[PDB]
Design a protein around this ligand. Structure first.
Ligand SMILES: C=C[C@H]1CN(CC(=O)O)C(=O)[C@@H]2CCC[C@H]1N2S(=O)(=O)c1cc(Cl)cc(Cl)c1
Length: 127
């Protein structure tokens, strides 16, 4: 399925080249511009655990998730991966625990040592 495909066939987008964040572009976005640090970014997403459970979905809430890019308001894999996206792009991200919730996890939903899968759509970004 999609998590296996991004694990086996995804691009390492880390600066360390440690395969901690892997990406596949699913839907090509607009032009060349990507958001910059500090921008307000608007996304839709879904998250799955490695046991196949969906743990989160913005579509199910009928409202995008909004954050300031590159400020540690989200797990590192998101600050790294969203920064690579064009407006309108949809991508898959595979997030090793060092770029997510680590050995702590995040009670109740995220276990210790969790690899996470996301599908993310960048809706918009504004200075
Ligand atoms: C639910 C909102 C965010 C939570 N955070 C911020 C934080 O944990 O302080 C995140 O960094 C990431 C990425 C942005 C979207 C949300 N997750 S999440 O999907 O990994 C997540 C979902 C849920 Cl239901 C619980 C938890 Cl702990 C994390």
């Amino acid at each position: 399925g999609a998590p296996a495909t991004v694990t086996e066939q995804g691009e390492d987008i880390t600066s360390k080249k440690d395969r901690g964040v892997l990406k596949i572009v699913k839907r090509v976005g607009n032009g060349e511009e990507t958001p910059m640090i500090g921008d307000k970014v608007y996304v839709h997403y879904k998250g799955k655990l490695s046991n196949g459970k969906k743990f989160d979905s913005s579509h199910d809430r009928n409202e995008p998730f909004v954050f300031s890019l590159g400020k540690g308001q989200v797990i590192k894999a998101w600050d790294i991966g969203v920064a690579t996206m064009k407006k309108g792009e949809i991508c898959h991200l595979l997030c090793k625990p060092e770029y997510a919730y680590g050995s702590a996890g995040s009670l109740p939903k995220i276990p210790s040592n969790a690899t996470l899968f996301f599908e993310i759509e960048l809706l918009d970004f504004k200075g």
